[PDB]
Design an enzyme around this catalytic site. Structure first.
Site, short mmCIF file in Angstrom:
data_model
loop_
_atom_site.label_atom_id
_atom_site.label_comp_id
_atom_site.label_asym_id
_atom_site.label_seq_id
_atom_site.Cartn_x
_atom_site.Cartn_y
_atom_site.Cartn_z
N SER A 5 0.84 -1.23 0.00
CA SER A 5 0.00 0.00 0.00
C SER A 5 0.87 1.27 0.00
O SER A 5 0.29 2.37 -0.08
CB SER A 5 -0.94 -0.01 1.17
OG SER A 5 -1.94 -1.01 1.00
N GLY A 6 2.20 1.11 0.09
CA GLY A 6 3.16 2.24 0.14
C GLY A 6 3.57 2.58 1.57
O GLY A 6 4.21 3.63 1.75
N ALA A 7 3.24 1.73 2.54
CA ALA A 7 3.47 1.98 3.98
C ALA A 7 4.98 2.08 4.28
O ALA A 7 5.34 2.80 5.22
CB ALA A 7 2.82 0.90 4.81
N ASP A 65 10.08 -1.90 10.54
CA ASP A 65 9.89 -0.43 10.70
C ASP A 65 11.08 0.22 11.43
O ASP A 65 10.94 0.55 12.62
CB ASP A 65 8.59 -0.08 11.43
CG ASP A 65 8.20 1.39 11.38
OD1 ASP A 65 8.98 2.21 10.78
OD2 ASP A 65 7.11 1.72 11.92
N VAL A 69 7.87 0.18 -3.45
CA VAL A 69 8.37 -1.22 -3.31
C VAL A 69 7.83 -2.11 -4.45
O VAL A 69 6.59 -2.11 -4.70
CB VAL A 69 8.03 -1.80 -1.92
CG1 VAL A 69 8.59 -3.20 -1.71
CG2 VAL A 69 8.52 -0.88 -0.80
#
Ligand SMILES: Nc1noc2ccc(C(F)(F)F)cc12
Ligand SMILES: [Cl-]
Ligand SMILES: [Cl-]
Ligand SMILES: [Cl-]
Ligand SMILES: [Cl-]
Ligand SMILES: [Cl-]
Ligand SMILES: [Mg+2]
EC number: 2.7.11.24
Length: 344
Positions: free
Chosen positions: A28-30, A160, A34
């Site tokens: 989702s682009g978090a 993260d 990618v």
């Protein structure tokens, strides 16, 4: 130097080594921009990240250096690591783009009927990775189910590191990004430390046992009232440690409440799980159980092995207090790209 090839992906031209094949957009682009790929050198399915605008400001250049330093350091079975880092640039003068490569993660904890045995193994692995992270004086600050990658064999990794600090809008209202945060960081009570991560592990453990969010607050103040109803209002000892006079005055406006009986909240749970939750979900951060202490708790007797719970090499973060120009952060980043040595 490998041979590179070009192709148009996610609105720009990607230039990557020939070893990476079958590139296809994912997520989702978090975590950034990618593509999924097949790595012909290792046989792994991989995630390839192309940084957007890595050197556009002092803030962005330092952010790029931080992410690359953290990912190069982490070498542990229960933590994300770096498989490769590259640039198509042949010199510092033409350096503009950075690409990062990691193992492709399918499902997160959110994506996965859990037995007590499943809860023991998942929380054991989070604590094994956290003992490693904390031994390097690194604070995660954002442990939550979406940041925990899990496979068909229930094997887990923590995600993260070195991404943008979450914005005030991102922490507002009925949002999962706030529900796992320790109260002393959610409200800026005091200088926080690594104990904030153990509060987050308690919130995750409770949700795996019940199937329900522990503190699903509609805003910061609603969430604080849900927390104090479970663990009790602060005593004189913790109130002294709250540096903000204004936060101390608000807390004192609330009617006093005792800590609740956790066997009556977590009805039917393993009594050893109830005991561990009581030692993680302590309001005074000085009194919480550490990752190293929690691995030795009787709840994990089936998995605990003190000769296979390793610590980290030391991690120098003196750069965090350094003031440099854009081109200086860019030169440090370039050196870290060309010095990378891949894992065995
Ligand atoms: N900085 C990171 N923390 O967790 C991550 C997971 C994937 C990636 C990827 F693959 F996009 F580079 C980067 C990070
Ligand atoms: Cl290649
Ligand atoms: Cl990994
Ligand atoms: Cl480049
Ligand atoms: Cl989440
Ligand atoms: Cl170091
Ligand atoms: Mg985060």
């Amino acid at each position: 130097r490998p041979t590179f090839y070009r192709q148009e992906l996610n609105k720009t031209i990607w230039e990557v080594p020939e070893r990476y094949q079958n590139l296809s957009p994912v997520g989702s682009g978090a975590y950034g921009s990618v593509c999924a790929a097949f790595d012909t050198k290792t046989g792994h399915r991989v995630a390839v990240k192309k940084l957007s605008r890595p050197f556009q400001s002092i803030i962005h250049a330092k952010r790029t250096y931080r992410e690359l330093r953290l990912l190069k350091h982490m070498k542990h079975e229960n933590v994300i690591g770096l498989l490769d880092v590259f640039t198509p640039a042949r010199s510092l003068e033409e350096f503009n783009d950075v690409y990062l490569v990691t193992h492709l993660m399918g499902a997160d904890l959110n994506n996965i009927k859990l037995t007590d045995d499943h809860v023991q193994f998942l929380i054991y692995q989070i604590l094994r990775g956290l003992k490693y992270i904390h031994s390097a004086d690194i604070i995660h600050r954002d442990l939550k189910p979406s940041n925990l990658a899990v496979n068909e064999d229930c094997e887990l990794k923590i995600l993260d590191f070195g991404l943008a600090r979450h914005t005030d809008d991102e922490m507002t209202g009925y949002v999962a990004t706030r529900w796992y945060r320790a109260p002393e960081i959610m409200l800026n009570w005091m200088h926080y430390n690594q104990t904030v991560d153990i509060w987050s592990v308690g919130c995750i453990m409770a949700e795996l046992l019940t199937g329900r969010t522990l503190f699903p607050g509609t805003d910061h103040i609603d969430q604080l009232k849900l927390i104090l109803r479970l663990v009790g209002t602060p005593g004189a000892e913790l109130l002294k440690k709250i540096s903000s006079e204004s936060a101390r005055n608000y807390i004192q406006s609330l009617a006093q409440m005792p800590k609740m009986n956790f066997a009556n909240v977590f009805i039917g749970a393993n009594p050893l799980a109830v005991d561990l939750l009581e030692k993680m979900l302590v309001l005074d951060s000085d009194k919480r159980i550490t990752a190293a202490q929690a691995l030795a708790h009787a709840y994990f007797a089936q998995y605990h092995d003190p000769d296979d719970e390793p610590v980290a090499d030391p991690y120098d973060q003196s750069f965090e207090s350094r003031d440099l120009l854009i081109d200086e952060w860019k030169s440090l980043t370039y050196d870290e790209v060309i010095s990378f040595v891949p894992p065995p």
